[PDB]
């Protein structure tokens, strides 16, 4: 059944929206002030800090960073008769914790929290990619397209586990491997137990994310090493390099800024009644009638800023430029020639140069974001029955496709990773960059509500460049 | 045990002989007509066409060449009161297929078929050498002595795999390499799978045929290339050039014409009882009491024709002229001054000029044809123990010949082919053209049945020329 999940997501988004309304009430902000991305970012990171129990518990035992008992940050921006001002106002954790407490009818709202962490992951992935950590681990910065949800902490649950990508998991595993190489953390203490439990859980998440059998079995053989040394390091690097083409269907949750949700909730559009979806038309239908303001530097182009924020909202920073432009309706500028900077504003930059303006979010078309992979993998490995069932009682043979039956079982168990690298490189060679994917699907029009008739895109515009980076 | 193989070969030759008797019965041919090489060639090539499933299956989908549903060729020659006549009589495939079906007590007679393909290979190798394909592949026609069984199709089994030579395998590999260079046949389709399977099987056959370790390891490193480009092309050319001296013991099966087998079977000499061998005295003992007739042009010398047909029967076209003459008893004329042409007769040449005559096959001596190589290779690399076993329990060292122990294992694996070309050229330099081979063996007399006492040949007849070609 899908009605229950729809009601649950509608309920928790209604809670988030009415929390945002409560914030707009308590901050004494004007109508325009509540349509700002920056203040939503500030309050939302404040919520992240308040609800992150582990960092807090690390902090009350560590009274450092000067003024840090329980209050952090808070750069609220207010419009003064056309000009702008920034104030560093500090808020307690317990008060706003309880404001959430009645902002969700007595619940913890963990799903909402995961929504905020995921929307932060999308903003960071859209703005800045961490080539720095990649090169730190020795890992090639050519594969930044594997950095989905890198800024996410491990505190996120299964819903948060859905969005964090393959390459980010390679990075976090490499971090723990380097730590275990530096010192003997693998002893029989409770620390070793929690490390191996986390390691096996993360490997299970990995094997869930992949699609082809060969990579799944190689990963299953990865955690056989009770004492991970150096071989699994290049094993995981090659895992990422092979997942370049055999990508895992991780997630692309379409999280939206708190201002848009709050404006919708304030207008009386209760999400529980008509339902809410995070994947279909629904996150789209709020945006063509949404007004968003933000601050811009006197050199930044607002036209680029609108495209970038729509990227971040729809987590399309790692999507191809051609289809993103087709859905948007206008050409999208790659990261190479963007005359803009990060949407976050520095704490030291001067107050005079900021100017507020409206953000354009309307898009001509819409499409469903499925958590799947390209059809090319199913082209490499076709589909069909392998077994048969006797319906009539007739004296006949039972046809069994035996050579694939051994392949599923792997009768002769794989010796090491290398034998798997062999046929996975063979599959990579079988791959082609002209393999059309997602057959039977298309882009629909905004007037469509039940996905009745799509239109297939056709891109013949030479080599404009399907690479947002470079 | 050797009795079972002897019985099997005797049985299948008895089947072939009684099939030939059935053909002589159904063709209504006279006594002399069944002693003709030409009619045996015609019926035998007809059998090849009937039992070759792949070409047939290519043909019923390709109804071309005019009159070609299921009937091909058939130039039967009949003697008319001294003169000769040629008739193009066409036979169906299924009828003669079933005639074989009871001609071998319900078996397929695949071994007999391989015997016919091998005897065709010997006739072609004796008559005409394919310098043309060699030059087509850019391959030097100085090495025609490596063309054993070139006309053989790949359908031949392990018994047929025994006779097809090293240079022919170089040629077929070069053909597939050129085809894979022309188009990308190496994709992940089923065609690529069958190509790599055939390629590895043929490389296994090659490594089976060679004798020295260095060439075997270089060949083992040949198929490491998953995408064969151009380097392995000259690698295989150099393989053939090195196998010039370090020849592989491929095979020299002594196949005999169907007329000789049929005459023996008709006389009541059942091969199952007294046994048959294809390698010892036995294929020889049928020939001194065998009568064979054939057609000859008014310019062709019958004396040369008898020597050439005995060459083709004994597959001694690539054997040295001195020993071939010694075993035959008379001088053998090289290909340079043979006033004869191919034993096959053209379809357009006139009926008047043909004249039939007896073929001389009796030879003074006999010798065993072992599938081995010259003793010179064992002179270059001597023989002896490398390890020892403790018989008495005595506190003593275990002598191990370590530097050759690494050599067998190749502890430092060879980088490329070039390091192997180095020491193989060194071995070629160590080679001498005066190295006497086949020590401990000799030529026996026809009166000998158990190989009791041979006589060693001694050739001091200057430089008559041990080269059938040139």
């Amino acid at each position: 059944n899908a009605t229950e999940i729809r009601a649950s997501v509608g309920k928790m988004i209604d809670g988030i929206g009415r929390f945002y309304i409560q914030m707009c009430t308590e901050l004494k902000l004007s109508d325009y002030e509540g349509r700002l991305i920056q203040n939503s970012l500030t309050i939302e990171r404040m919520v992240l800090s308040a609800f992150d129990e582990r960092r807090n518990k690390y902090l009350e035992e560590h009274p450092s960073a000067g003024k840090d008992p329980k209050k952090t940050g808070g750069p609220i921006y207010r419009r003064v008769d056309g000009k702008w001002r920034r104030e560093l106002i500090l808020y307690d954790k317990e008060e706003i914790r309880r404001i959430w407490r009645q902002a969700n009818n007595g619940d913890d709202a963990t799903a909402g929290l995961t929504h905020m962490m995921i929307w932060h992951s999308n903003l960071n992935d859209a703005t800045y990619q961490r080539t720095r950590a990649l090169v730190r681990t020795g890992m090639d910065p050519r594969m930044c397209s594997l950095m989905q949800g890198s800024t996410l902490p491990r505190r996120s649950g299964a819903a948060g586990a859905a969005v964090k990508g393959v390459g980010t998991m390679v990075m976090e595993l490499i971090r723990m491997i380097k730590r275990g190489i530096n010192d003997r953390n693998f002893w029989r203490g409770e620390n070793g137990r929690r490390t191996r439990i986390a390691y096996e859980r993360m490997c299970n998440i990995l094997k869930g994310k992949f699609q082809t059998a060969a990579q799944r079995t190689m990963v299953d053989q990865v955690r056989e090493s009770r004492n991970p040394g150096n071989a699994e390091f290049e094993d995981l690097i090659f895992l990422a390099r092979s997942a370049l083409i055999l990508r895992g269907s991780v997630a692309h949750k379409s999280c939206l800024p708190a201002c848009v949700y709050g404006s919708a909730v304030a207008s009386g559009y209760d999400f529980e009644r008509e339902g809410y979806s995070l994947v279909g038309i629904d996150p789209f239908r709020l945006l063509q009638n949404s007004q968003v303001y933000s601050l811009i530097r006197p050199n930044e182009n607002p036209a680029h800023k609108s495209q970038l924020v729509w990227m971040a909202c729809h987590s399309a920073a790692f999507e191809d430029l051609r289809v993103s432009s087709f859905i948007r309706g206008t050409k999208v500028v790659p990261r190479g020639k963007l005359s803009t900077r990060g949407v976050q504003i520095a704490s030291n930059e001067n107050m005079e140069t900021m100017e507020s303006s409206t953000l354009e979010l309307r898009s001509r078309y819409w499409a469903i974001r499925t958590r799947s992979g390209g059809n090319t993998n199913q082209q490499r490995a076709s589909s069909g029955q392998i077994s048969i069932q006797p319906t009539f009682s007739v004296q006949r043979n039972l046809p069994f496709d035996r050579p694939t039956i051994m392949a599923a079982f792997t009768g002769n168990t794989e010796g090491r990773t290398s034998d798997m690298r062999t046929e996975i490189i063979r599959l990579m060679e079988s791959a082609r960059p002209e393999d059309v994917s997602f057959q039977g699907r298309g882009v629909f029009e905004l007037s469509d509500e039940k996905a009745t008739s799509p239109i297939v895109p056709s891109f013949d515009m030479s080599n404009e460049g399907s690479y947002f980076f470079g």
Side-chain angles (χ1 to χ4, degrees), chain A:
Chain A
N1 171 4
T3 59
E4 293 176 350
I5 297 89
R6 192 177 290 92
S8 64
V9 294
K11 180 264 290 180
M12 51 76 58
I13 296 169
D14 190 7
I16 297 169
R18 94 191 211 260
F19 181 76
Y20 182 75
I21 297 169
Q22 183 62 255
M23 293 303 97
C24 294
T25 299
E26 190 276 331
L27 275 296
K28 295 178 179 179
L29 294 174
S30 179
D31 186 74
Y32 286 90
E33 311 295 8
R35 313 310 91 81
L36 294 174
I37 297 169
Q38 293 64 350
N39 64 7
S40 64
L41 291 166
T42 59
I43 318 164
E44 184 178 1
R45 288 192 296 272
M46 182 278 288
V47 175
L48 302 183
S49 64
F51 276 91
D52 194 59
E53 294 177 350
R54 290 181 178 91
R55 283 175 189 169
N56 290 318
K57 291 180 177 179
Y58 303 152
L59 294 174
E60 72 270 14
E61 301 325 300
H62 303 344
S64 65
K67 157 62 201 70
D68 196 45
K70 297 202 289 144
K71 296 177 177 180
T72 53
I76 297 89
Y77 294 89
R78 292 182 183 174
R79 164 158 288 237
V80 180
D81 195 0
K83 293 177 180 178
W84 283 96
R85 282 184 188 168
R86 169 195 315 176
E87 293 176 351
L88 293 173
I89 301 299
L90 298 172
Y91 291 165
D92 273 302
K93 296 180 185 298
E94 62 295 10
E95 172 71 27
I96 297 169
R97 268 274 202 166
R98 87 148 172 72
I99 297 169
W100 291 97
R101 174 52 31 171
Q102 70 274 16
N104 63 7
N105 294 27
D107 186 74
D108 312 331
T110 61
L113 294 174
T114 59
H115 186 286
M116 282 74 75
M117 283 74 75
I118 297 169
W119 191 107
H120 288 88
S121 66
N122 320 128
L123 62 83
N124 296 115
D125 291 324
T127 60
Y128 174 74
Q129 72 295 357
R130 307 204 261 114
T131 61
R132 165 52 60 61
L134 294 174
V135 176
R136 179 67 180 271
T137 60
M139 173 46 237
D140 189 358
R142 289 286 186 181
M143 283 73 74
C144 298
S145 62
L146 296 176
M147 295 298 102
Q148 294 82 17
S150 64
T151 61
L152 294 174
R154 294 181 184 173
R155 182 182 38 67
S156 63
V163 298
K164 61 177 70 66
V166 176
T168 61
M169 295 298 102
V170 176
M171 295 299 102
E172 51 86 10
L173 294 175
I174 284 171
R175 289 184 182 174
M176 183 278 288
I177 296 169
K178 300 289 94 175
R179 291 182 182 174
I181 293 167
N182 290 337
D183 291 331
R184 321 287 89 76
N185 61 4
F186 301 105
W187 286 119
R188 294 180 182 173
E190 190 276 331
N191 283 337
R193 331 287 185 74
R194 59 88 173 173
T195 66
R196 75 170 91 71
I197 292 170
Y199 165 46
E200 53 87 10
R201 289 182 181 174
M202 294 182 286
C203 293
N204 293 320
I205 297 169
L206 294 174
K207 78 180 182 68
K209 294 191 292 292
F210 293 101
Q211 305 183 335
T212 187
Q215 291 176 333
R216 289 182 182 172
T217 74
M218 185 277 287
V219 174
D220 296 350
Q221 285 185 149
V222 168
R223 84 200 71 71
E224 293 180 350
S225 65
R226 293 181 184 173
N227 290 318
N230 315 112
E232 81 305 340
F233 182 75
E234 70 266 13
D235 291 331
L236 294 175
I237 297 169
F238 182 76
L239 182 63
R241 293 181 184 271
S242 64
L244 270 172
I245 296 170
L246 286 176
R247 288 183 295 282
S249 64
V250 182
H252 286 88
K253 287 187 180 180
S254 63
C255 295
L256 294 174
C259 296
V260 172
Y261 288 128
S263 60
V265 169
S267 293
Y269 293 100
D270 165 22
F271 296 96
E272 294 177 350
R273 294 179 184 173
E274 292 180 350
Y276 191 92
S277 66
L278 289 170
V279 194
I281 308 167
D282 186 74
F284 296 167
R285 54 151 311 141
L286 294 174
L287 294 174
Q288 70 275 16
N289 324 297
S290 67
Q291 292 175 335
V292 170
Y293 292 90
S294 165
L295 293 173
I296 297 169
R297 264 161 271 191
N299 54 7
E300 291 215 350
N301 189 359
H304 292 171
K305 180 145 205 203
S306 64
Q307 294 177 335
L308 294 174
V309 302
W310 182 98
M311 294 298 103
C313 291
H314 296 285
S315 66
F318 312 150
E319 202 190 8
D320 73 298
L321 296 177
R322 287 172 187 63
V323 176
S324 66
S325 65
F326 182 76
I327 297 169
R328 172 73 149 164
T330 187
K331 294 179 180 179
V332 289
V333 183
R335 194 61 161 112
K337 290 182 178 179
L338 284 171
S339 62
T340 46
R341 292 183 184 174
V343 65
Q344 292 61 40
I345 192 66
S347 296
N348 289 337
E349 63 88 21
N350 189 358
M351 70 66 68
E352 163 57 40
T353 61
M354 294 298 103
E355 176 48 69
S356 65
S357 70
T358 301
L359 277 296
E360 291 178 350
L361 277 296
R362 294 159 316 291
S363 63
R364 294 183 186 172
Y365 292 165
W366 72 266
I368 295 170
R369 63 176 178 85
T370 68
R371 301 183 189 176
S372 65
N375 286 175
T376 184
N377 51 37
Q378 291 179 335
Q379 303 296 342
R380 301 152 195 174
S382 64
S383 301
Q385 293 179 356
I386 292 285
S387 180
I388 212 68
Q389 286 80 19
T391 294
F392 291 99
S393 176
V394 181
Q395 66 287 28
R396 286 302 201 174
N397 185 82
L398 305 160
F400 292 164
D401 187 74
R402 184 167 182 184
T404 300
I405 297 169
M406 283 74 74
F409 282 92
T410 62
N412 298 1
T413 63
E414 313 87 350
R416 286 182 184 174
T417 53
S418 64
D419 63 358
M420 295 298 102
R421 319 166 98 86
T422 299
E423 90 281 357
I424 193 66
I425 297 169
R426 289 185 179 176
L427 294 174
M428 295 298 102
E429 293 179 353
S430 68
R432 283 300 180 301
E434 301 66 30
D435 294 349
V436 178
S437 62
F438 293 100
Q439 294 175 334
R441 300 176 182 177
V443 175
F444 299 91
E445 293 177 350
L446 293 174
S447 65
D448 173 328
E449 291 86 6
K450 277 74 69 177
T452 186
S453 179
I455 52 169
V456 57
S458 66
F459 293 99
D460 306 68
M461 187 66 204
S462 65
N463 279 336
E464 271 187 326
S466 57
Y467 299 96
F468 179 44
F469 303 71

mmCIF file of all heavy atoms in Angstrom, chain A residues 240-254:
data_model
loop_
_atom_site.group_PDB
_atom_site.id
_atom_site.type_symbol
_atom_site.label_atom_id
_atom_site.label_comp_id
_atom_site.label_asym_id
_atom_site.label_seq_id
_atom_site.Cartn_x
_atom_site.Cartn_y
_atom_site.Cartn_z
ATOM 1 N N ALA A 240 35.245 1.332 -6.902
ATOM 2 C CA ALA A 240 34.734 2.628 -7.345
ATOM 3 C C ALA A 240 34.961 2.824 -8.844
ATOM 4 O O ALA A 240 34.079 3.310 -9.567
ATOM 5 C CB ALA A 240 35.392 3.753 -6.545
ATOM 6 N N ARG A 241 36.141 2.435 -9.327
ATOM 7 C CA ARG A 241 36.459 2.614 -10.741
ATOM 8 C C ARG A 241 35.549 1.772 -11.631
ATOM 9 O O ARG A 241 35.210 2.184 -12.746
ATOM 10 C CB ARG A 241 37.929 2.278 -10.988
ATOM 11 C CG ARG A 241 38.905 3.244 -10.336
ATOM 12 C CD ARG A 241 40.346 2.870 -10.650
ATOM 13 N NE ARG A 241 41.298 3.733 -9.961
ATOM 14 C CZ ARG A 241 41.764 4.875 -10.447
ATOM 15 N NH1 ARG A 241 41.386 5.331 -11.630
ATOM 16 N NH2 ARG A 241 42.633 5.580 -9.726
ATOM 17 N N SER A 242 35.159 0.583 -11.166
ATOM 18 C CA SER A 242 34.231 -0.249 -11.927
ATOM 19 C C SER A 242 32.801 0.255 -11.788
ATOM 20 O O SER A 242 32.012 0.179 -12.738
ATOM 21 C CB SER A 242 34.337 -1.704 -11.470
ATOM 22 O OG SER A 242 33.938 -1.843 -10.117
ATOM 23 N N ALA A 243 32.444 0.774 -10.610
ATOM 24 C CA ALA A 243 31.126 1.359 -10.412
ATOM 25 C C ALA A 243 30.965 2.657 -11.185
ATOM 26 O O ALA A 243 29.855 3.195 -11.242
ATOM 27 C CB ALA A 243 30.871 1.600 -8.924
ATOM 28 N N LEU A 244 32.056 3.189 -11.735
ATOM 29 C CA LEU A 244 31.945 4.294 -12.687
ATOM 30 C C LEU A 244 30.912 3.998 -13.769
ATOM 31 O O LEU A 244 30.050 4.834 -14.065
ATOM 32 C CB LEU A 244 33.301 4.569 -13.335
ATOM 33 C CG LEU A 244 34.216 5.569 -12.652
ATOM 34 C CD1 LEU A 244 35.581 5.557 -13.318
ATOM 35 C CD2 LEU A 244 33.570 6.930 -12.761
ATOM 36 N N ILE A 245 30.990 2.819 -14.376
ATOM 37 C CA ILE A 245 30.062 2.447 -15.439
ATOM 38 C C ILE A 245 28.896 1.629 -14.898
ATOM 39 O O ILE A 245 27.732 1.931 -15.174
ATOM 40 C CB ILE A 245 30.814 1.698 -16.559
ATOM 41 C CG1 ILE A 245 31.845 2.624 -17.208
ATOM 42 C CG2 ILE A 245 29.839 1.166 -17.596
ATOM 43 C CD1 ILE A 245 32.801 1.925 -18.150
ATOM 44 N N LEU A 246 29.183 0.586 -14.119
ATOM 45 C CA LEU A 246 28.138 -0.171 -13.427
ATOM 46 C C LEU A 246 27.782 0.555 -12.128
ATOM 47 O O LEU A 246 28.099 0.128 -11.017
ATOM 48 C CB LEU A 246 28.581 -1.605 -13.176
ATOM 49 C CG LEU A 246 28.585 -2.500 -14.414
ATOM 50 C CD1 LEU A 246 29.139 -3.870 -14.087
ATOM 51 C CD2 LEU A 246 27.178 -2.615 -14.975
ATOM 52 N N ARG A 247 27.102 1.683 -12.299
ATOM 53 C CA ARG A 247 26.739 2.539 -11.182
ATOM 54 C C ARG A 247 25.653 1.892 -10.330
ATOM 55 O O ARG A 247 24.825 1.113 -10.807
ATOM 56 C CB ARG A 247 26.268 3.897 -11.697
ATOM 57 C CG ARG A 247 27.392 4.755 -12.237
ATOM 58 C CD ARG A 247 26.894 6.110 -12.672
ATOM 59 N NE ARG A 247 25.979 5.985 -13.799
ATOM 60 C CZ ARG A 247 26.362 5.782 -15.052
ATOM 61 N NH1 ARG A 247 27.640 5.688 -15.379
ATOM 62 N NH2 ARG A 247 25.439 5.669 -16.002
ATOM 63 N N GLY A 248 25.670 2.229 -9.045
ATOM 64 C CA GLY A 248 24.645 1.773 -8.134
ATOM 65 C C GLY A 248 23.514 2.776 -8.012
ATOM 66 O O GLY A 248 23.729 3.984 -7.945
ATOM 67 N N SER A 249 22.291 2.253 -7.986
ATOM 68 C CA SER A 249 21.106 3.088 -7.843
ATOM 69 C C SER A 249 20.947 3.516 -6.393
ATOM 70 O O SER A 249 20.219 2.874 -5.629
ATOM 71 C CB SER A 249 19.866 2.334 -8.316
ATOM 72 O OG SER A 249 19.620 1.200 -7.502
ATOM 73 N N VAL A 250 21.620 4.596 -5.999
ATOM 74 C CA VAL A 250 21.717 4.920 -4.582
ATOM 75 C C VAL A 250 20.452 5.631 -4.114
ATOM 76 O O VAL A 250 19.624 5.031 -3.418
ATOM 77 C CB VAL A 250 22.971 5.777 -4.323
ATOM 78 C CG1 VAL A 250 23.117 6.084 -2.855
ATOM 79 C CG2 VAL A 250 24.212 5.073 -4.852
ATOM 80 N N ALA A 251 20.271 6.882 -4.538
ATOM 81 C CA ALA A 251 19.052 7.660 -4.312
ATOM 82 C C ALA A 251 19.265 9.053 -4.887
ATOM 83 O O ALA A 251 20.399 9.492 -5.095
ATOM 84 C CB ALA A 251 18.670 7.754 -2.833
ATOM 85 N N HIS A 252 18.155 9.745 -5.139
ATOM 86 C CA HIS A 252 18.206 11.151 -5.521
ATOM 87 C C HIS A 252 17.075 11.957 -4.893
ATOM 88 O O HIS A 252 16.406 12.723 -5.593
ATOM 89 C CB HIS A 252 18.183 11.290 -7.044
ATOM 90 C CG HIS A 252 19.478 10.918 -7.696
ATOM 91 N ND1 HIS A 252 19.773 9.629 -8.084
ATOM 92 C CD2 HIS A 252 20.564 11.664 -8.007
ATOM 93 C CE1 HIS A 252 20.983 9.599 -8.616
ATOM 94 N NE2 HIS A 252 21.482 10.821 -8.584
ATOM 95 N N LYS A 253 16.843 11.782 -3.587
ATOM 96 C CA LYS A 253 15.718 12.417 -2.901
ATOM 97 C C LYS A 253 15.594 13.903 -3.213
ATOM 98 O O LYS A 253 16.556 14.664 -3.063
ATOM 99 C CB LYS A 253 15.818 12.219 -1.386
ATOM 100 C CG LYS A 253 15.500 10.812 -0.918
ATOM 101 C CD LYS A 253 15.464 10.735 0.599
ATOM 102 C CE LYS A 253 15.151 9.330 1.084
ATOM 103 N NZ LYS A 253 15.106 9.253 2.570
ATOM 104 N N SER A 254 14.402 14.318 -3.648
ATOM 105 C CA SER A 254 14.137 15.704 -4.026
ATOM 106 C C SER A 254 13.660 16.481 -2.797
ATOM 107 O O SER A 254 12.470 16.716 -2.577
ATOM 108 C CB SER A 254 13.117 15.762 -5.156
ATOM 109 O OG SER A 254 11.872 15.225 -4.746
#
